[PDB]
Write a protein that binds this ligand. Sequence first.
Ligand code: A1H7X
Length: 148
Amino acid sequence: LLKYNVGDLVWSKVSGYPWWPCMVSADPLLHSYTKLKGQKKSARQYHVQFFGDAPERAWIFEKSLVAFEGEGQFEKLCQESAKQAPTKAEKIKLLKPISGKLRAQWEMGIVQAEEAASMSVEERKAKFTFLYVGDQLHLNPQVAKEAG
Ligand SMILES: Cc1ccc(CNc2cccnc2)cc1-c1ncn(C)c1-c1ccc2c(c1)OCC(=O)N2
């Protein structure tokens, strides 16, 4: 009984980054969207696409994944992550708003994620699945036009 499937939108928490809007996808080289690290039933990973103008992808642990509904969760997500922080300096970083190129990318990515939430699982897959040509990770030309 998998929690997520190709197309499902999720918030991903990576260490050293804020919570990010994502979408579960099939790995272009491995062809899988979920794995078990070291065959440990607990350590399940999901291949996700990170919403934004400078796109990325990664195998994220399921324990670091929250179902995405909208940007309204972001604040409550930062509050929980700040509750289990090891220092006051860690709690400040998590509660401090995103800035610089990361902020501009996060907001642009929030636009695509919320746009995809209002679509069918196949409509959002067709619109926001990345296109890959060799080692090149490309955005869908319509998505690239909407970003810049
Ligand atoms: C998976 C991932 C891969 C690579 C890198 C390094 N990127 C990079 C690129 C060029 C120069 N310097 C650094 C980061 C990450 C990553 N890990 C966790 N998070 C939250 C990210 C991440 C951060 C920002 C964006 C993103 C993913 O995807 C879309 C986007 O527009 N912005």
